[PDB]
Design a protein around this nucleic acid. Structure first.
Ligand SMILES: Nc1nc2c(ncn2[C@H]2C[C@H](O)[C@@H](COP(=O)(O)OP(=O)(O)OP(=O)(O)O)O2)c(=O)[nH]1
Ligand SMILES: [Ca+2]
Ligand SMILES: [Ca+2]
Length: 429
DNA sequence: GGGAAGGATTC
DNA sequence: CACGGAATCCTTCCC
């Protein structure tokens, strides 16, 4: 029942929160209309100019289009919710939802039929489902399960990569080669008993089967010539199901055709909004608009879009280049009191230091985040070559940054509700 | 072009 | 009664 938005937007009223969603959507539109004009002034000359450019570049990509690797994406249904649930009954029926009363991490399948969805505040959730059993997290209980499943994976693709505890990619290309002539042996697994062929389609039934047994919990996966496509298929037959996209061009193109752009990673709330006002809704519409986009978005975005439109995506899963940053933030009831604030700041660098020195990193860039009670987020940050890594060392800089703030502006309180500290820029590449 | 601020996205 | 936390990449400027 779509009146479900009636309940929410209603209880959301005009809270010091909502007031920021507008002071945001309004800033968005500005970005959109600011773009519209840009368009309205592109001579057809320029457009045929870029068309040729992009057309040429695309023809290049299309050539170097690789359709050999066979990528998989696994995203075991619910999970956080499915674990706290299936692995602690009484909730085999009942609609739960992992998270607090102020934030929901995951939702119970039966809780979604009511509107409760991930990233939905705690209270809202219940004022939409009083049956709300907001079960508190247990990251440890899952970790033990992740490694429990990450275990089965290495069996098909040793050199793989897991994005989180919820999903993971794997170029089962090396395996399917060998699994060619693996007759009978470790292809038939014990429940009685069943076998699995040589098809990629298959080894993906065998992994949802093994995960099935070794955890009771279900999964879901997609199979495609690349990371991107794969990730989109997985969530196709979402509730315990898998979808493939044979390795020929045409199949990809047909799967991309009417695909709503929002349904891919990297494209979200705002990018979708922005392109809509441009008439773009589906990947096809995104390919025929390749020219305009060329003169409207960073050499990246449009370069990016053009891949999505062509259905191109990474083919070799690579080990994430060490790390980029590390931070800590805390949300809370107002904390105006200047002397008080410093206290929490220092206590952060502290947590950060432990966290940091626990992987033996030593960064040379400290950043602090300050979010008002009206959510007016702000981020001041300093950088040095001191290559810092200690609680004190860090607090030195931060203690200062948070000081330059209180000063410069606000001869009166600094009504905070969120503060964070991030340490970045530190390796020797 | 090297960046600092502040977004945008995804789990 | 109260809209998380992290990590990474992108966008809008500057000196
Ligand atoms: N928004 C948000 N999601 C989170 C967070 N922590 C875990 N998640 C989960 C919620 C989603 O179930 C999950 C993956 O996104 P989807 O929208 O793809 O859900 P998922 O793939 O788990 O499908 P399922 O939940 O299995 O139907 O990320 C969080 O902190 N914020
Ligand atoms: Ca999942
Ligand atoms: Ca997913």
């Amino acid at each position: 029942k779509e009146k479900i938005n009636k309940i929410i937007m209603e209880a959301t009223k005009g809270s010091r929160f909502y007031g920021n969603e507008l002071k945001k959507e309004k800033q968005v539109n500005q970005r959109i209309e600011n773009m519209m004009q840009q368009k309205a002034q592109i001579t057809s000359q320029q457009l045929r100019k870029a068309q040729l450019q992009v057309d040429r570049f695309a023809m290049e990509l299309e050539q170097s289009r690789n359709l050999s690797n066979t990528i998989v994406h696994i995203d075991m249904d619910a999970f956080y919710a499915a674990v706290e649930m299936r692995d602690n009954p009484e909730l085999k029926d009942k609609p739960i939802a992992v998270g607090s009363m102020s934030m929901l991490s995951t939702s119970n399948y039966h809780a979604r039929r009511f509107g409760v969805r991930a990233a939905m505040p705690g209270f809202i959730a219940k004022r939409l489902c009083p049956q709300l059993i907001i079960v508190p997290p247990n990251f440890d209980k899952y970790r033990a399960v992740s490694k429990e499943v990450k275990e089965i994976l290495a069996d098909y693709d040793p050199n793989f990569m897991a994005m989180s505890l919820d999903e993971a990619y794997l170029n089962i290309t090396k395996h399917l080669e060998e699994r060619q002539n693996w007759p009978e042996d470790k292809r038939r697994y014990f429940i009685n008993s069943v076998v699995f062929g040589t098809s990629a389609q298959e080894v993906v039934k065998e992994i949802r089967f093994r995960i099935e047994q070794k955890t009771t919990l279900t999964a879901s996966a997609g199979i495609a010539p690349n990371t991107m496509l794969a990730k989109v298929c997985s969530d196709k037959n979402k509730p315990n199901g898998q979808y493939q996209i044979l390795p020929n061009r045409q199949a990809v193109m047909d799967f991309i055709k009417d695909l709503p752009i929002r349904k891919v990673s990297g494209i979200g709330k705002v990018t979708e909004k922005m392109l809509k006002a441009l008439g773009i809704i589906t990947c096809t519409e995104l390919y025929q608009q390749r020219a305009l986009l060329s003169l409207l978005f960073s050499e990246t975005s449009w370069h990016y879009f053009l891949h999505i439109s062509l259905g191109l995506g990474s083919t070799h899963l690579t080990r994430d280049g060490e790390r980029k940053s590390m931070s800590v933030e805390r949300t809370f009831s107002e904390i105006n009191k200047a002397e008080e604030q410093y206290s929490l700041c220092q206590e952060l660098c502290s947590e950060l230091a432990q966290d940091l020195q626990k992987e033996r990193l030593k960064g040379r860039t400290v950043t602090i985040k300050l979010k008002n009670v009206n959510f007016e987020v702000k981020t001041r940050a300093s950088t040095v070559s001191s290559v810092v890594s200690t609680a004190e060392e860090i607090f030195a800089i931060a203690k200062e940054l948070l000081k330059t703030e209180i000063d410069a502006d606000f001869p009166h309180p600094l009504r905070l509700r969120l503060m964070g500290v991030r340490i970045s820029s530190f390796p020797n590449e």
